[PDB]
Amino acid sequence: ENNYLSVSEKTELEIAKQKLKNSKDPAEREKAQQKYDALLEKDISSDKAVITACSNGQAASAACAGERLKVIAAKGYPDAYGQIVNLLNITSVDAQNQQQVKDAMVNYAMVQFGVDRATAQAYVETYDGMKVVAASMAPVIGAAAASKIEVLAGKQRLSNSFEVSSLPDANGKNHITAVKGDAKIPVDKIELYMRGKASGDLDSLQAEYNSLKDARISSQKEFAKDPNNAKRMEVLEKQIHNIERSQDMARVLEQAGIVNTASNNSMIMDKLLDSAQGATSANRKTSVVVSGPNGNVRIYATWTILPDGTKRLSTVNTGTF
Amino acid sequence: STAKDIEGLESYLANGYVEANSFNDPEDDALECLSNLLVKDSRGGLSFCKKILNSNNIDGVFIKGSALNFLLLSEQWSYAFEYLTSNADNITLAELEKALFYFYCAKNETDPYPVPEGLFKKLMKRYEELKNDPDAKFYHLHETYDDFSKAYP
């Protein structure tokens, strides 16, 4: 049943299944689910035909995802994965295939999450929704193929005169990035931060921060005795401050009529990328003006100059009222 | 392991980022490096609070408030009192709100430190200048100023 797990791994898989079923500790069940999933991935990826199709840089190919699909069918939806596997031959999204990419994402989100068509469409048309959607494919088609699907959906969503692709960072973490010339924008800076979708549970951070704030008000001399107190409060304050600027930026564009659409976000990426072209360490700050039915908004950007001379967007900000 | 934190700081003052391949706001990376240093090594951590509090070549404004706040809550509080007395006309939004907040809390201390003359008027002068900066609300300046004045009428 799990022909490519060692004897030890079969034992661990069974323990994970038991803890998943019997533990009254949600943290222990979450660990057990992760353990079950990691053992299943080792089983599938250790299939001899999966190895042949998925190794030496081919993990994102259609061949690789198709072999993994065959294996998963043998140890058991499959029509949603068929349209998805076919997208893995695509290298660039243009008018020929963009609707093929969109429909496969929509149809998959309906089958996988049980939502109706209109709800699936709204989910896949967002960066954060599409990240959840592609991530949910990884156990079946593999992480590299799921990552490629997220990039493909990004090229379709953000169609304009830049490309979208995935760039590794300092740790091997993928960042979906709009790229043009010698300039780069990690797209979450536009689609999340500029749209008021900064990470962090505002209400959780606010209560942890207000907790420390009252202690400092109650006895500042005592609070100051340990610099850990002021370290935690200042980091909470900054996180809260980033959310509040992120939400205020979103509302500035909102009130101007520049709402959260792919078209608007794509247009913003393209103008920012143009403004960065050929920049130098002399001036690392640029700005563009975008126009909506209710007025204009100036968007300020700061760029990091990378060692190879290209520019990567570091901060994006609007003004306020 | 603090020399790491010091080299992250040195790079922020030099190129405006902690490390090249970090996708964060470099001010946030630097705040972490500064607070990590202050807890592990005060003597060197307060030094970079000064190196931030005088640098006319730092992107972020928040981090200056962080640096000032860290000195006010340290044994070198007096370096911060004398910084606010002379630079009150030049201090940013973040510094002014951290100043107004420190003294609001100091109203509750048993043993408040000796406040230099006219400092409260210099702060209140600076507030009336920065009151109408649209960025004031992100520091909650009008609220912090309300507690500061209702603490010291």
TrEMBL record, chain B:
It comes from the Bacteria. This is Uncharacterized protein. It comes from Escherichia coli.
